[PDB]
Design a protein around this ligand. Structure first.
Ligand SMILES: [Cl-]
Ligand SMILES: [Fe+2]
Ligand SMILES: [Fe+2]
Length: 174
């Protein structure tokens, strides 16, 4: 049977879920309990964490513009997701998506992770660039698994303290 229902109009779905595609929620998963995790991500949202995804991530910036802060070949880089852009991120490339525009919408597609395949979330020192803190998580449900992780980082000057230069990371904002 059609476990995930019939086809439906995507722009209309996005318009209908617009109140969820802005703070405080910011994103909405299209289908539940599927192998492909299909999400629409709105804005505005800025963040300081880098994601280490053990699988690929596909992006299609449908409305508005956004960008990814990246670590590529040991250097800080930026990949712009201009409206209309698509992009495929290889596994383990550290990325911190920034979504400055209200009313923006990006299709993001990921895969469910098998047991034992973990995701990393990392923060880096603004002063010297050294890794400050890394948490590894078996990512089953983004909504329950992720906010407390970020919250525990922000609340702890110990976790935010750079092991190299001693500078305390600013936490939630930079
Ligand atoms: Cl994103
Ligand atoms: Fe990611
Ligand atoms: Fe540092």
């Amino acid at each position: 049977m059609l476990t995930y229902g019939a086809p439906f109009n995507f722009p209309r779905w996005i318009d209908e879920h617009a109140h969820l595609l802005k703070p405080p929620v910011g994103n909405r998963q299209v289908w539940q309990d599927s192998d492909f995790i299909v999400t629409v991500v709105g804005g505005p949202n800025h963040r300081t964490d880098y994601h280490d995804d053990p699988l690929e991530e596909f992006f299609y910036q449908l409305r508005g513009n956004a960008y990814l802060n990246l670590w590529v070949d040991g250097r800080r880089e930026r990949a712009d997701l201009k409206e209309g852009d698509i992009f495929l991120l290889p596994p383990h490339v550290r990325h911190s998506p920034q979504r400055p525009e209200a009313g923006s919408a990006c299709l993001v597609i990921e895969r469910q992770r098998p047991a034992g395949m973990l995701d990393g979330f990392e923060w880096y020192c603004d002063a010297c660039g050294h890794l400050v803190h890394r948490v590894e998580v078996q990512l089953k449900s983004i909504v329950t698994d992720l906010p407390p992780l970020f919250e525990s980082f922000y609340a702890s000057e110990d976790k935010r303290r750079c092991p190299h230069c001693g500078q305390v990371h600013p936490g939630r904002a930079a």
